Symmetry: C3
Subunit: 140 residues, 3 copies
């Protein structure tokens, strides 16, 4: 029930790395050289139709993160998006990062969400947390 | 099921959906900010929100700002029970300063459905095929 | 319904900071000194078994983010993972960041997800958004 179409011969069908993996691994359709502390938008050359009740989160893989300081920016693929799915890769490492066509460089998660109507009110109910934020619960 | 919000000042803007089925409500800065290269700022929305039960509000980055200006969103977990001013923690990872003006959509808010499970310690867990596989265990390509 | 086991004497059972906090706070099992612009994989020394229908997202705490420019990389703990839960911490601040054993340095969110079957199709339906992305809706 996750539907995709290839936009070029360079796309690879996403794959799940394990039986209960949260993500479908996304493959680069092209080579990219990302200098240290730089970014690139990596084309997958796929369009997707997400199942009703979710959006597609482009999320980072752990190996690339831990090994090479690679992160994923942006990442919110909308249910109504019909364009090329682009992975916004951040290279926070000291080294340049090579992406080759067919490298799995991010993963796609079908994050379940509500599409709530927004409503303005004058006052919200109170809660126990209240305005507590930004470390209000402490360090340890 | 509604997302309720209240303006904490006249400088707040009602969040808006960018497209009919956009996962997020765009969040507007209530203030001007000049964010230096490789620095962060907590952008005040001057709204408080009441999330529908069984979700939290994820402050997520917009893709244009990410792809074009190396802007990212830190933190981002707005709890169901938060009634404070919603802050967007913006990271400017670019080499140039980033300008936020009051009224700019600088992030989006997603109603992420979650569980609130009770936590239970056990002697050991069931085994799986993945097992202790992680950090690239499945390969590069 | 979120089961965990301690992998060592140095782990701490995850705790919620408020009644309806999205995250279970994760505690470091070790001391780390993370220099500026560096990363570390902080070991929790716990294994977890997430409830069916979610994955465990390691998310950053706002206190650490706003005060110290601490961010969380990777973060996708899969339902089938039985290894040591690692927190990929990125220190983007000017100062080194000290993690002490027992510090709450991230949180784990039980994000509800679909595990869809993937299906390749010829083409997808048209939407109003279409291929609009990357700021197509404007700045303000
Ligand atoms: O990582 C991403 C993020 C977004 N996108 C595409 C799909 C998404 O539906 C579209 C818009 O995403 P966002 O709303 O998160 N970004 P922004 O608000 O800047 O774009 P827009 O003005 O079009 O809504 O951009 C990608 O291809 N990769
Ligand atoms: O991006 C954010 C993240 C959090 N917050 C606020 C709302 C949230 O409910 C509250 C607590 O967030 P976190 O639990 O993610 N951070 P931390 O654990 O540091 O704060 P606390 O100790 O108060 O729980 O801080 C923001 O305003 N913007
Ligand atoms: O922050 C993280 C991310 C992942 N992990 C572990 C748990 C997760 O189930 C496993 C694999 O996560 P990802 O699939 O997100 N990363 P990657 O694809 O690089 O690893 P693998 O090849 O094993 O699937 O690594 C952590 O402990 N901490
Ligand atoms: Mg994986
Ligand atoms: Mg948008
Ligand atoms: Mg980041
Ligand atoms: Mg907290």
């Amino acid at each position: 029930q996750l539907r995709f179409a290839r936009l070029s011969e360079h796309a690879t069908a996403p794959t799940r790395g394990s039986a209960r993996a949260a993500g479908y691994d996304l493959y680069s359709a092209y080579d990219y050289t990302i200098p240290p502390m730089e970014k690139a938008v990596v084309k997958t050359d796929i369009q997707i139709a997400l199942p009703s009740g979710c959006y597609g989160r482009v999320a980072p893989r752990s190996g690339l993160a831990a090994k090479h300081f690679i992160d994923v920016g942006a990442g919110v693929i909308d249910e109504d998006y019909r364009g090329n799915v682009g992975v916004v890769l951040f290279n926070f490492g000291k080294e340049k990062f090579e992406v080759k066509k067919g490298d799995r460089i991010a993963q796609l998660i079908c994050e379940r969400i509500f599409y709530p109507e927004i409503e303005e009110v004058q006052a919200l109910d109170d809660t126990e947390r209240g305005s507590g934020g930004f470390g209000s619960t402490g360090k340890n």
